[PDB]
Amino acid sequence: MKIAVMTDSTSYLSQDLIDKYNIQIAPLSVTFDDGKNFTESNEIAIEEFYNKMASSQTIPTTSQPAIGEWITKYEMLRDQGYTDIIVICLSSGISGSYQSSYQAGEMVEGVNVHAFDSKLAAMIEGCYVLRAIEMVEEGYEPQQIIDDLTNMREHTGAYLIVDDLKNLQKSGRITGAQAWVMKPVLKFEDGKIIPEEKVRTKKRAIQTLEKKVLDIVKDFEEVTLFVINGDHFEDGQALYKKLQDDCPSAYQVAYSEFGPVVAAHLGSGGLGLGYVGRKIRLT
Ligand SMILES: CC[C@H](C)CCCCCCCCCCCCC(=O)O
Secondary structure (H helix, E strand, C coil): CCEEEEEEHHHCCCHHHHHHHCCEEECCEEECCCCCEEECCCCCCHHHHHHHHHCCCCCCEEECCCHHHHHHHHHHHHHCCCCEEEEEECCCCCCCHHHHHHHHHHHCCCCEEEEEECCCCHHHHHHHHHHHHHHHHCCCCHHHHHHHHHHHHCCEEEEEECCCCHHHHHHCCCCCCHHHCCEEEEEEECCEEEEEEEECCHHHHHHHHHHHHHHHHCCCCCCEEEEEECCCHHHHHHHHHHHHHHCCCCCEEEEEECCHHHHHHHCCCCEEEEEECCCCCCC
């Protein structure tokens, strides 16, 4: 038994971790209104993406990995001698990437695929990859890893804000906000993005993100927090610095950013605060 762990590009793992653990990536893509298509990778300079998105009369659209891209990746890992593949996917609530990876796993011969619906995105999704790789090294079997990740998902969540709900509304990735067709605070709930509160200022929304999350993770035996920032540098920097001041060092507090595919749906000003009830290995 040789177990591989792979994921899609929206887990936004650093190239260092991808290189070190040889993590295969099924990439998602972005398509701009001038017909220019782009595949997600760390090669992309993210400020260049925000610039083109701001200079687009029409919001760009995104694509999940086609089912054939999952298949090709599964066959490559099988043909390298892997018998089992753990697949960490973007939330099934916002993308078909998981169901495609699931269906692709049924269709590929000679290797066992264990697709996992992270029910989130970005480096919070990435944390499931890093937990899976850690357990593989420790000798666990695929069902034990899927069981552990499922328990991890019960103590994992995220809150977030955006400058303008237009991008989420255009793509249909905000649920239950038909009345809004003030500053909204959103959260993930069973893999979908819903409104949580509405505050008067952006600064109060950022303080609200911290309070919501700290109130939750206070009861966890292990805590990892991720500040995941968009195109406004000082917003993520302000939240990250304040968390380092307000949290004990027993909390793991990390920083990351949104890639093009997620940025296309949030628009400018996206800022997330995510939590995992585990001490995830980030090295
Ligand atoms: C701290 C964690 C953060 C709060 C996470 C925020 C994630 C926001 C996701 C926006 C929606 C992306 C849909 C991509 C669909 C891709 C497709 O299938 O086309």
